[PDB]
Amino acid sequence: SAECAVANELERINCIPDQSPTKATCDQRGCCWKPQGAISVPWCYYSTNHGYQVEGDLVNTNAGFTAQLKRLPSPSLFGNDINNVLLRAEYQTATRFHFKLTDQNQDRYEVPHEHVQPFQGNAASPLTYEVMVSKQPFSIKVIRTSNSRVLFDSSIGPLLFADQFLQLSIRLPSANVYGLGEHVHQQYRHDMNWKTWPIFARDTVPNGDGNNLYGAQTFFLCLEDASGLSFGVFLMNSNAMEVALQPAPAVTYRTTGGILDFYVLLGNTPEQVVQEYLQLIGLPALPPYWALGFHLSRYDYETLDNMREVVERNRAAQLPYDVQHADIDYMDKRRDFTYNPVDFKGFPELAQDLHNNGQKLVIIVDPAISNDSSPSSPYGPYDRGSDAKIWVNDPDGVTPLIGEVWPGKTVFPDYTNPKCTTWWENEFKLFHNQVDFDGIWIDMNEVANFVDGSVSGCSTSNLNYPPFTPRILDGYLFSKTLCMDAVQHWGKQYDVHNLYGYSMAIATAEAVKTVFSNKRSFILTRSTFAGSGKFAAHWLGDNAATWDDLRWSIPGMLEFNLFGIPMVGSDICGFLLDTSEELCRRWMQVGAFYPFSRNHNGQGYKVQDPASFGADSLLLNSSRHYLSIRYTLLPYLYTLFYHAHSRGDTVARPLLHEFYEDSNTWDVYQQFLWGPGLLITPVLDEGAEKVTAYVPDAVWYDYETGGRVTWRKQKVEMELPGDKIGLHLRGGYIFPTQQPATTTVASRQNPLGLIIALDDNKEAKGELFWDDGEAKDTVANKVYLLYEFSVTQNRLDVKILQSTYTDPNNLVFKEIKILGTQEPSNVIVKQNDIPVQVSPNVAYDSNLQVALITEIELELGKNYTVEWDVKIRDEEKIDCYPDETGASEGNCVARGCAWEASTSPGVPHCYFVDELYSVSDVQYDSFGATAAISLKSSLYASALPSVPVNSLRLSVTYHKENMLQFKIYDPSNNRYEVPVPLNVPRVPSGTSESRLYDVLIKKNPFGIEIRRKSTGTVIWDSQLLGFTFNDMFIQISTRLPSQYLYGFGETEHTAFRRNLNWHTWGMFSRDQPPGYKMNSYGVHPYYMALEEDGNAHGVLLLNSNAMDVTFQPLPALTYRTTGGILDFYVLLGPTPELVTQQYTELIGRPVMVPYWSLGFQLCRYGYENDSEIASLYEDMVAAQIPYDVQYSDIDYMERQLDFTLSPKFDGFPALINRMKANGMRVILILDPAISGNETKPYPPFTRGVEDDVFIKYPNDGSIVWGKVWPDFPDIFVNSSLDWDSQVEQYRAYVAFPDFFRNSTITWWKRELRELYTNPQDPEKSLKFDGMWIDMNEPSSFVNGAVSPGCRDSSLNHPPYMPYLESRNSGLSSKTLCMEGEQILPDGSRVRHYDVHSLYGWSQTRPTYEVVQEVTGERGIIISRSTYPSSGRWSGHWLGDNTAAWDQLRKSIIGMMEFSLFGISYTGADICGFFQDAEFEMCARWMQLGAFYPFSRNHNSIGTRRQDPVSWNDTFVNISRSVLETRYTLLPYLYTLMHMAHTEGSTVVRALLHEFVSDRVTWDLDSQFLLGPAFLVSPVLEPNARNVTAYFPRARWYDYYTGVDINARGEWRDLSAPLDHINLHIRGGYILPWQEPAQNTYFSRQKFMGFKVALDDDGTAEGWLFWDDGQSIDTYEQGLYYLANFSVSQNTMQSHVIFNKYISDANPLKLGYIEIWGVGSAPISSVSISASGEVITPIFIHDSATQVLNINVTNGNLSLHNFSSLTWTSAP
């Protein structure tokens, strides 16, 4: 159908809103019928035929435009359809659009609002909104010109305009709709799912069944999006109506009369929309100060005596109580303006009694007046009123309408009649003269008849029975109210029914002006309309004592604040039913924070006043406690009412009004604020002692303690005991306080105070409004104090913006409380720049960081300034003098620092006290954040080493959900950046929703904060003192999450964990045996830290200049570098094994080593002649000690010259070939430095000079010479000569290649190619399999260059010399000059000073490429010097150890650290390198070293042989045994190397990587894991035959026996004889293994196997990767086998993921399967499915130890054919 063209079933507008859906009715109305569809979806919907058209054009006017609309021909719905309608639009203000639709010919009813008056002016300019009117069918659309977004759209449905039916539908930009009342929505946000709400004032209980209540409010707010952009709509119409929400999203107003008079209000935030609305309808009244106290009331006190007893009881309990209410009891025969002469005799005396105790009296007054006035018994109110003719009349307009209420037959005053107001005033005056009351409570002002219409009933008119009736209760407009044809001054009851309460409140406000002189009073009303808040407060009606009503109280209160009636609350402890102690207690707790706080009970229920529950009840104690807190904060509350009254702010506020940037705050309705500063979190559930609460993104302080909470922008479970409610102060605000008393009268004479809650930038602001609190128009007559407080830079400024009032009580501020500060000291108070004599006494709690400045008196009404200076603790002290020499008080005062000789060790003597840089221009983007940093203190910065940089930029980038980068650099000048490429995402994916972190840039001092979203833990905090960015001195510090830090190397440490007791460690490559506090071969600026909850993160600083790190016990970490920029990468975790996978993804994953390189290796410096290496080979085979690689040191080279062959090793080439034929492999050593003193042809140097590959001076062009190993030709070398003498007499001059350069790369590769294939003689060709590149620091035996010496000392001995070795010899010690020049690939020139630590890294990749070219296979590189991203192409060995006992444990620590650094192939020299090995030590070391990934026995020259065959038979047996274990496990070990290469897993893992929950594992460094499954527990001590090992919580099987040991989380003593190493397998894992042999070549041709360790559940899992083990890129080119295996339900299944290597032509045989933990029951049978072939294997089950051994060698089963193995246990 074409008329029925509706895009979306959700955009259907119901055409039958009255009766049930029937095709008969729809066909009659002309609406399309479509019953197919979902629930609540309307089958009947209007067609395009319905509506109006604009005939002509938009005639313009002075205020806007006018348009004539005629009715599109269509069937009438309810009849009397107006045909000609006029539209008038008025651009009243830049943010307020008004339009009105009315009849063109006839005049209709319009609301006579007292405040809103007709607009006389011209159109405003410029406007923030655009109005576009569609001509056919007619529609109006308001558009936000700023972002071109439609806010109001009336096109979704037709305009309907009949006499007794008007309709308009509006499409909305979002579903965030708040407002529309008065009903119980049970939630602040509005459910847009086909819900309809009636609006018609009515006396009924707030049951919660969606019924019309006592008031009529048509305003709603809509929040467009997270920018804060918002708008509001208000309809000025007093007729009965209903509002229909639709999941379009869309709202629709359906009314029974009047005109459509709309206002659209725009604002940048929700609060601005509310302010716009309240400025239009009228600003709220300022209440008297006493009305903010607590109020007590009860329906039936029966007698005055009972009332008096309640008063006395509560007074005696000392409960904060100020106002006592009186219900209709006092009134005799419930008649107004009268009191009971007997039961309530003495009522006047009660009023006086209250006043003498500083308490108040509020009396109730009803609108209905009785008619029983006879000459015998006169009733004055009635007689005087009848004389004035001020009653509501019957339709005849003359006869008073008679209704029935409390007094019985009654008449109703017409408050819209001016004469009525005069009568009303007089009545109050006479009664006030009898009883001296203080305020008025008006009730049943809906109006409310106990009968329907009148005592005579209602006429049959279209007013009493209209054609359309909203979904009102009962269904009759005259039910429990007056007849709709009754006549008043403003019109008929049909039009003014919703205005009765409004009109009465106006009249009462007038009466008060006369009765009470210059004394604003209090009018509490029930019935309300828009604009009532200017005159009265409101209470939410007759609730019941249930847990639902408790919950519903909060959204009700929040909506009324929108409507401009801030003085509002519900009845505490319920009005109907009986309350329980818990409900009344939990209600008194939250009720203490209602704007209007009153306990009100009904008739015939248990007394519920707090003192009723007993003088020492928990309820009374709790009530007294929180009511005292309310009284302390009344100055703060009163000022909030001032801002509502003056500007239109809310008092009790929803979270979304402050924290709209987040979407988690757009639904909260169980938590609220007082103004912007105080968050209230109640318990609203029966029996609960915990709440789920959302904490928004701010600093929050616990009100009761003052301590900061750690929660931010997250949900929490809060522990709230029966007598506690959640209260928190927001940082950045100042709160005025006043010492509390039992009444407001006694409290306003007590001293004042301030609470200062500081924020992230250590700043706060506040206001105090002060006045008499009783007089009227104080603000209008400008008779009041207004203060403005502000804190910044440890200075408070009080400042009086208006002072025309003087307080008679001589009040003073006596205390100042500061939250989130360091200890304040030297407090100076001055008034108007005039010193005030005072002795401020400060008291600081160190843990909560809370201070109380007392002994001060700030006279209210005068300007002042209080300044303080702060004390720094000894743990937060940052060294201001890290220079090598010059430490003195004179040198500190100059730098601008403080000097204190701390007796405590470690604590610095000269510390920092001020900041050098300021922050500005902070901008947060979707995928980043930036800021400008500018030097403030030029002089002090200059005193610090080097020249200061002035302008800096901070850039933060959100690369991924778990990774981010932040960088600080000079935007004006290029400074050196490390040329090591990293792998970052090209397009940022740090989407706000997915990302694991948040960033915050702070000020005073400057700093960056990074926080983990899930737990709210801060993982990086830089707001410490010391940030410096000089040219050659950059410093920055961070606060560590916990005391656990692992990483930073390469430097020997006593442990895996780092000691943070004032320790400084340098980093700059040097040829120095690893030692304590000694810079070594590699520089890795990376750490991983554990948070206290066991979450983990990692941080990389990408910098290559010389540097150091200091560990303060704050915990704090400081970095100091000698150049470059600051470039940080952070990995968010969340587990210790995912930070390594994240790190290696960024730097590059480890290299895959050749299978043969996992065998055992032999090396020895001092090989005399070739025939010796031959002898070793033969002897090794004889004793059957398995080995795979034989190394050759500089001995094979002539005079230690590279690319030469010594005459002593003439047969070497032949030997290499013979060994290789038997499956052995050979690695050769190469040094980088090339000799320049050769007399005979030396191609390397000659061609190097021609290709210019050597490092030369900046411009001079001379080669920087040095002295390493190469010797001089034609001299005799005497070993006796001291080393110093040899370096000076025998060592030659050498040149160092620049490996960054393209020419150098070509020369180097060609030289290695000629080494493999000798061009001069093929007989001299050396067929190597890998390369060992050593002395690549670079390293020299002469500091700087050869003598004369170096040139530029500025670089050699820099301004700041990091804490390295020989700290007085400078950077050039044992290395090149720092001025040497190098050339990057792109041609740019750099200094050795910047790239020194990247020299080994620069050589590594070229070497790797050439080896893979000459050999045609994978190859292996081993490098001494390493830098982040070196593990991508090479392994590393832990350098020159010594044969000593402490060196065994140091090796374990070293290999765990290099795994974190992403270098998986690593190991130490077995049996030591220096000194001579000892039998026991060399034996114990052989056992340990059998489990290093790089397992090599290496010794120095002139030392006892350490080779397995250099000892006796006892050793040969120990060595052979352990090495056979190694060769057995190689398939498992090789699979581990594969996963690391492909996923970034670790091979030698720590225990905390697998068991992070056990905190015992956080300090273990004497045991380790290979992969997840294999635990190694060595003996590391002399003469020890037992080892104490900790077994984490799991199933641990002994490797040798296969028996499970019961040690789950316990220590145990393991037997460890000299010939044994303790090994254990973790249950739940499957290990592939293979039979051992002399070399891998032979072993790869034997049977495979699978040890299966079942867990407690009886499940196990494992992997196998298999390839050739030699070819390049086997995985990238897809020639490999990869499979995952699983064991469960007594069966094992193989899941080949990829197979292109294992075939029938190339089989991998499987022969043995051992299952551990199968249980004690005998095993009936075992079956193997070989590609559809069942095989019965040989088997044996020893139920003593529970191990099934399955043999299948005869089965001839290849792995590719295996599918599954099943075993059935005996029933």
Ligand SMILES: *[C@@H]1O[C@H](CO[C@@H]2O[C@@H](C)[C@@H](O)[C@@H](O)[C@@H]2O)[C@@H](O[C@@H]2O[C@H](CO)[C@@H](O)[C@H](O)[C@H]2NC(C)=O)[C@H](O)[C@H]1NC(C)=O
């Ligand atoms: C309810 O409170 C009473 C009285 O407590 C005192 O007053 C409070 C307002 C607060 O200032 C407390 O620190 C005071 O102790 C508790 O009862 C005992 O009352 C006697 C006499 O006043 C007092 O000396 C004791 O110290 C109080 N007992 C204690 C502290 O154990 C009473 O325990 C509270 N109610 C409940 C249910 O615990």
Ligand SMILES: *[C@@H]1O[C@H](CO)[C@@H](O[C@@H]2O[C@H](CO)[C@@H](O)[C@H](O)[C@H]2NC(C)=O)[C@H](O)[C@H]1NC(C)=O
């Ligand atoms: C108060 O109003 C009621 C209702 O109008 C009056 O009661 C009626 O009085 C008339 C005589 O005037 C009787 O014929 C009716 O039977 C009464 N109606 C009832 C009882 O429903 C009453 O007289 C008024 N009292 C006055 C004016 O003093």
Ligand SMILES: *[C@@H]1O[C@H](CO)[C@@H](O[C@@H]2O[C@H](CO)[C@@H](O)[C@H](O)[C@H]2NC(C)=O)[C@H](O)[C@H]1NC(C)=O
């Ligand atoms: C408190 O301090 C303020 C700021 O110094 C004073 O306010 C100024 O008063 C002068 C009086 O001639 C006015 O011209 C200025 O407009 C005011 N504001 C500013 C910003 O200068 C105020 O007088 C002081 N109040 C005292 C001394 O009680």
Ligand SMILES: *[C@@H]1O[C@H](CO)[C@@H](O[C@@H]2O[C@H](CO)[C@@H](O)[C@H](O)[C@H]2NC(C)=O)[C@H](O)[C@H]1NC(C)=O
């Ligand atoms: C090769 O080197 C070996 C070892 O240096 C030489 O012979 C032995 O040297 C050791 C001392 O290193 C002595 O203890 C032995 O007595 C030597 N043996 C002999 C038979 O002299 C050997 O001479 C060298 N020459 C070659 C192999 O040409």
Ligand SMILES: *[C@@H]1O[C@H](CO)[C@@H](O[C@@H]2O[C@H](CO)[C@@H](O)[C@H](O)[C@H]2NC(C)=O)[C@H](O)[C@H]1NC(C)=O
């Ligand atoms: C290595 O140097 C030492 C020390 O200079 C030489 O030893 C001396 O040789 C002379 C030869 O005439 C003897 O008179 C001395 O007694 C030796 N000792 C000392 C302490 O002077 C040694 O000869 C050199 N070795 C060589 C050249 O092979």
Ligand SMILES: *[C@@H]1O[C@H](CO)[C@@H](O[C@@H]2O[C@H](CO)[C@@H](O)[C@H](O)[C@H]2NC(C)=O)[C@H](O)[C@H]1NC(C)=O
């Ligand atoms: C191999 O040499 C080792 C080291 O000298 C011998 O070990 C010692 O043997 C004695 C006598 O049995 C024991 O008292 C010592 O405790 C052993 N020391 C160590 C460190 O174990 C060993 O006996 C020799 N083996 C052979 C077969 O001679």
Ligand SMILES: *[C@@H]1O[C@H](CO)[C@@H](O[C@@H]2O[C@H](CO)[C@@H](O)[C@H](O)[C@H]2NC(C)=O)[C@H](O)[C@H]1NC(C)=O
């Ligand atoms: C493990 O070894 C330790 C250290 O040798 C043994 O403890 C000592 O045993 C001797 C036996 O004569 C006692 O004299 C010492 O007092 C013991 N020292 C300590 C610190 O206890 C221990 O008995 C061995 N325990 C085993 C194998 O379970």
Ligand SMILES: *[C@@H]1O[C@H](CO)[C@@H](O[C@@H]2O[C@H](CO)[C@@H](O)[C@H](O)[C@H]2NC(C)=O)[C@H](O)[C@H]1NC(C)=O
């Ligand atoms: C063995 O490998 C297969 C294939 O990679 C794994 O199965 C997949 O598992 C993922 C993650 O649970 C699922 O999304 C896929 O649907 C699975 N693919 C299939 C069944 O073809 C399997 O989980 C691995 N087994 C073990 C124990 O890791």
Ligand SMILES: *[C@@H]1O[C@H](CO)[C@@H](O[C@@H]2O[C@H](CO)[C@@H](O)[C@H](O)[C@H]2NC(C)=O)[C@H](O)[C@H]1NC(C)=O
């Ligand atoms: C696995 O099964 C095979 C076949 O039954 C066993 O090998 C045979 O062992 C017997 C006894 O030593 C010899 O007579 C045969 O010559 C062996 N055959 C071969 C081909 O070597 C083997 O011992 C079993 N393995 C285990 C650990 O039980």
Ligand SMILES: *[C@@H]1O[C@H](CO)[C@@H](O)[C@H](O)[C@H]1NC(C)=O
């Ligand atoms: C070494 O092992 C062999 C083979 O088991 C054995 O015969 C010999 O006695 C062992 N030697 C020692 C000293 O234990």
